[PDB]
Enzyme design. Structure first.
Site, PDB file in Angstrom:
ATOM      1  N   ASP A 177     -26.460   1.502 -29.356  1.00 36.99           N
ATOM      2  CA  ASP A 177     -27.404   2.515 -28.874  1.00 36.99           C
ATOM      3  C   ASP A 177     -26.818   3.919 -28.984  1.00 36.99           C
ATOM      4  OD1 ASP A 177     -25.585   1.775 -26.785  1.00 36.99           O
ATOM      5  OD2 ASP A 177     -26.955   2.532 -25.249  1.00 36.99           O
TER       6      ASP A 177
ATOM      7  N   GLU B 174     -26.194   0.194 -23.986  1.00 39.95           N
ATOM      8  CA  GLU B 174     -24.947   0.385 -23.237  1.00 39.95           C
ATOM      9  C   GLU B 174     -25.004   1.628 -22.338  1.00 39.95           C
ATOM     10  OE1 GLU B 174     -22.356   2.895 -23.566  1.00 39.95           O
ATOM     11  OE2 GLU B 174     -21.268   1.888 -21.930  1.00 39.95           O
TER      12      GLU B 174
HETATM   13 MN   LIG Z   1     -20.964   6.823 -24.089  1.00 40.55          MN
HETATM   14 MN   LIG Z   2     -19.596   4.257 -25.808  1.00 36.87          MN
END
Ligand SMILES: [Mn+2]
Ligand SMILES: [Mn+2]
Ligand SMILES: OCCOCCOCCOCCOCCOCCOCCS
Ligand SMILES: OCCOCCOCCOCCOCCOCCOCCS
Ligand SMILES: OCCOCCOCCOCCOCCOCCOCCS
Ligand SMILES: [Mn+2]
Ligand SMILES: [Mn+2]
Ligand SMILES: [Mn+2]
Ligand SMILES: [Mn+2]
Ligand SMILES: [Mn+2]
Ligand SMILES: [Mn+2]
Lengths: 389, 375, 389, 389
Positions: free
Chosen positions: A80, A138
């Site tokens: 991401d 994440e």
């Molecule tokens: Mn980051």
């Molecule tokens: Mn990262």
């Protein structure tokens, strides 16, 4: 088998670089990585792996089974991007306005795709399985790791290894540390309700701004008194929403803050002490407090046995990069969720640019040395081949 | 020769009520009072008075000259309305939605008009001249009284007298107090500029929320330590604009404040002391402070001779209070001339949505002011 | 009758001055006024009054009973002196240790003795009873008034009248104000119990200096927020006893303060708010507080009806001094204890030295115009004869 | 040697213990260690070494010269005791009432004496010189290292090695850490001068208790905002001397505090931020501030190369005991003065009792495993022999 690994990886360096650049150009936000997830699943077409799709939403679990019985090692790369306007610099800078791979997740994906392909052609050199984890989401709570665990990404898995490129650490080596290595995070909102009234009659009112301001001053004792000097904790009030009218005593303020603790015990202490201050504020100022306290990523705990094994293995292989101990790092990382379900090691690849300014992660000018790609693959591959021998 | 006065008033009461209801029905905002300034001007048509329609912005000065030299008393009634949505359930409620005469300025205007016509009829009965001040824009800074003073209104005036209706005083007499009786006002805006950054690296940032919070804390010592117990001061921070992002140390906050002092010396002390702290915050926290300090209404000084003067004159005809919280732009007249501001009971909530008052206030007001005028 | 009284008092002005100077020459401290109390008692020998002497400690109550049924008026004069070394240098300056009549109590006693003597000669001219209160220990808490009161000094008394000479007010008038005219007092001790410990492990301790310091900071809101702007209150911490070793976290601190309020309602608000902050400190910081809060002198309430009557009575008597309204005064006065128990009036006689610089009460150079003696006697006597007509 | 060293040392373990117990029975305070210094001088009589006895007061420097070309290595053991009444119940407990070897300085001296005697017997086995530093006064500032350095103790010296037994780390391993291992120290006195005055006229005074309290409150931000979460620092105010008359506005308060920082940059930032608050108090409250800021022991810096070397050497030899990385430690240590001058390592040997309750340093019940003596000598000797080979 190591020898063969290294030269195969060296020979595919150009491919890692080309892949990073394509992914850097097409970054997508957390929970909206439709094209990135499709690109990763398409990469494994024609290659001898099992790819399971939609593990989390956009969760991808590629299994490399040697055909023989043995351990299962998971290796993790996130994909991401962030809501940041890119200011590099670079010919392959993001063409998706307002979003940028400002944390090297494109580079994590790049090296992992090429390493996975490579490990897939070497099933004759290990036993058991590699589970490659390509993780979305994440960067933004609740994160991807959580959703992937709930969908069984760790079924069968004995250990997890992950690597993060560090734009702030010297290229030419990899870095490690057993135990707690990255901080956990919590968030809170506090509503402080007093009583509004005309500004000329403060005795008739109960000033929420004064109470909230006394709260901010008292809060500094959490870090300065309540934590050990050897603990690592942060309590930031990033939002004191007390905007009002000149001559009206303000009835309510909304406070929002965030909390970091390098250990779980430190997070627990901070939460206890902020709750004590918040409750006590009600008695001290006669205000009503509404505290919402939301735990978020845990601290990242590098399993001491596994992490030392990783550093031992890498030093004993003799590669073209150094291996050394490092200090714990400020940001939170959702790899910490893996690290709490299985014994894991999250290690770092030096990625500081050779020339020019050195910018930190999430900055619009963020950039890495692209030779962190090969070093990451060599490091992780070496661990995979020794582990699982 | 003041029963004539008295009796002529008592007679025209019902006239005061009509007028009051009519103005309450058609209220107009400060600096937007076109139709009320017109109405006040027309009321005096047919009456032996001189009317100035623009002294200044819509200031109405009616002079009642006895034709004889030569002392000059000014009497004041204000006429602007307030931006509130009337909820009284009255048979003469505001037709201008969102606007209300919720401070009783319609009552001030009503009785004063009627007392003025009466005084025009007794030109034989007094010497010098009366200046009736019908004042717009009392409610919204800068006023109000301010412009009027510069634009002609006080020229040749030696004393000023004013009356407010107090919806929260029983309603059976007229209350007063010598000396400083209502607080003056100032306001300020304080920009606290630190340095923003990511929330996990406080050492690389300078937290403006923390600096600002510490400022508000220290600020309490202005009233609690810097003023005499026998002074009346208020320092309120009504706005602390530090709205931001979780996860980001805030780079700037905007603080807005509201100050009251009962004397002009108290206001100056408060200002000095706020400036000391503002400046000190810079040294203490490393922030940059931009302080905009705006003076506003002066404290209302009821001239002590003249105030007892009017109380004695009132007592000696025939049928003291605490200082009051609101600021009142009458203070501007009272700064330039020996003046007196007194109160008229009107208990049936000022500036309240359901604002109402006894209508016996109107008549009591004219009685007491007229009496004083003839002296 | 009045003409009688004034003439008689005028002829005795020299006796007032001689008694005053004698008393100014031999001053005695609060609760130590043995020589002065004996002189006051000795004065009344030979005179047609009833002298009660044990009510209470050094307290003298003398009754002048007309022998006819009627009202009872108490008139009060105090006689304690102050711990100040006289540097006024007058011929009659204190030759007793380091103590001085720096509040004009020698003048109160002096005019009162002569007035009482005169009134006893006029039993024909009034009905009921005069009670003369010669009161010790005004200057030091708990005070003489409270003690005299618990010893029945106000038994059967309808109203109380008192006079204070004022060194800062113009000689030639008497001054009055209805309602609250002088401040009342309270005092408190706050013990803040935390948990001591080695200075470098704050997390194992609960810092009492930090909690106490926050307390003092928060306390500023009592006056700055909780009181009406038009009220008159002061909260001073004169003692913050937190002395210890530089490197030990302090276990306990002792805080001592002093409070003034112009109204008894102001004093009650202050007490309630200080108790709120003391118990809020416990809840916010987890310390244990022991707040000892001692009410002391009430605020002095001049009964509006009685005070107006006194003012009017003096104005309509053909007297050679003015009477006018004054402002409320900063100092506390234990006369307030009487004014709490009976409708009462405390009035002031202007005493400023007509020439030379004027010094305030409780000053080494403090000095009063001696004309204040006669004015006080005439004023009090005029009220007496009218009230007891 | 090198197996000769270990065998010789092992055969002398009994001697190590007896010296330790004797020294334990007869401890002496810092700057008062006349008999312990004498004893140490008496030990080297009849032993082939070069003893200097007046290197600073009580400073003993023993040179073990091989006669041959080579490097020079100083090794350090301290010998002062503490003002603590012993409560261990040991047979050899202090017979000097109120004094106790509560930091294991008796053990350091014991193992060192025996090691140096052994090293004197092996002048044929190494090259260069060994400078044995017997140092007094470690516990009380300004301690012993500085005077010894000023008197030329580090002349010709290339590296310095010191050992501390650790009563709270497990016997039997040696523990090390490159970089900052132990905190540095500072202390400060702040005088806050306002203007005294009558407690009910605060506008005429400038309240030092108020300013002082706002200062303590603001001081919390030094640690909570000015320091990185990853830095280690403490600011404690142990003394807030504001004792006064409850009803007088206090003219002056004296504040005393204690500071710890794990790095010298941390210490410097703390000093700067305290001075900024101090100077800023003057501007905000109009008080005058006199700050005495006194730096005391610097933070202890282990030179990364030499300590990595020391650790490698230990692990590769084949000793009976393990070698592992430790965390940095809270207490201060004047060894830090040597470490600033020469590249140094201060390492630790596990000395926790293997049975019963574990008590920390400076505790009346402090106790160590006596196995830490042999282990310490074996470690230091092994480094001496490999370093000087
Ligand atoms: Mn980051
Ligand atoms: Mn990262
Ligand atoms: O005059 C103040 C200007 O502020 C701009 C900030 O840049 C100056 C250096 O600051 C860079 C890193 O921030 C350090 C943290 O600030 C701590 C104290 O701030 C004091 C302001 S100089
Ligand atoms: O408890 C209120 C807030 O304190 C938070 C700080 O906590 C510091 C450690 O707390 C330990 C709790 O023990 C409470 C007091 O125990 C007193 C007896 O302990 C004596 C042996 S240390
Ligand atoms: O505002 C910036 C400079 O301030 C001007 C002078 O301030 C001096 C410091 O004193 C501030 C405290 O004020 C307390 C009130 O004291 C009044 C009497 O002081 C007499 C001279 S110290
Ligand atoms: Mn209004
Ligand atoms: Mn109004
Ligand atoms: Mn006195
Ligand atoms: Mn007195
Ligand atoms: Mn020690
Ligand atoms: Mn030690």
């Amino acid at each position: 088998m190591n020898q063969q690994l290294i030269e195969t990886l060296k020979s595919k360096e150009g491919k890692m670089i080309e892949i990073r650049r394509y992914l850097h150009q097409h970054p997508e936000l957390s929970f909206h990585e439709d094209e990135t997830a499709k690109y990763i699943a398409e990469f494994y077409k024609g290659k001898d792996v099992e790819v399971e799709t939609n593990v989390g939403p956009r969760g991808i679990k590629v299994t490399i089974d040697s055909g023989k019985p043995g351990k299962t090692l998971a290796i993790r790369a996130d994909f991401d991007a962030l809501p940041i306007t890119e200011d590099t610099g670079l010919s392959f800078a993001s063409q998706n306005k307002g979003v940028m791979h400002a944390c090297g997740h494109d580079a994590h994906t790049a090296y992992m795709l090429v390493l996975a392909e490579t490990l897939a052609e070497m099933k004759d050199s290990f036993t058991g399985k590699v589970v490659v984890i390509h993780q979305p989401a994440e960067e933004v709570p609740p994160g991807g790791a959580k959703t992937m665990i709930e969908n069984g990404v760790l079924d069968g898995v004995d250990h997890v290894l992950g690597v993060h490129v560090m734009s702030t650490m010297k290229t030419g080596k990899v870095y490690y540390r057993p135990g707690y290595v990255q901080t956990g995070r919590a968030f809170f909102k506090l509503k402080v309700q007093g009583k509004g009234g005309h500004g000329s009659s403060p005795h008739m009112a109960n000033d929420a701004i004064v109470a909230g301001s006394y709260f901010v001053t008292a809060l500094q004792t959490v870090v300065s008194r309540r934590l050990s000097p050897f603990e690592t904790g942060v309590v930031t009030i990033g939002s004191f929403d007390g905007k009002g009218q000149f001559n009206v005593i303000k009835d309510v303020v909304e406070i929002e803050g965030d909390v970091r603790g390098l250990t779980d015990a430190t997070k627990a202490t901070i939460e206890k002490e902020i709750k004590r201050l918040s409750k006590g504020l009600e008695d001290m100022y006669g205000v009503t407090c509404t505290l919402e306290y939301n735990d978020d990523y845990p601290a990242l705990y590098n399993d001491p046995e596994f992490t030392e094994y990783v550093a031992k293995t890498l030093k004993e292989a003799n590669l073209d990069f150094g291996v050394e101990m490092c200090e714990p790092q400020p940001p939170s990382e959702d790899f910490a969720y893996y690290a709490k379900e299985r014994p894991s090691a999250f290690i770092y690849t030096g990625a500081a640019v050779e020339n020019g300014e050195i910018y930190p992660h999430h900055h619009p000018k963020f950039n890495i040395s692209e030779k962190s790609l090969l070093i990451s693959a060599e490091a992780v591959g070496t661990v995979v081949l020794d582990y699982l021998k």
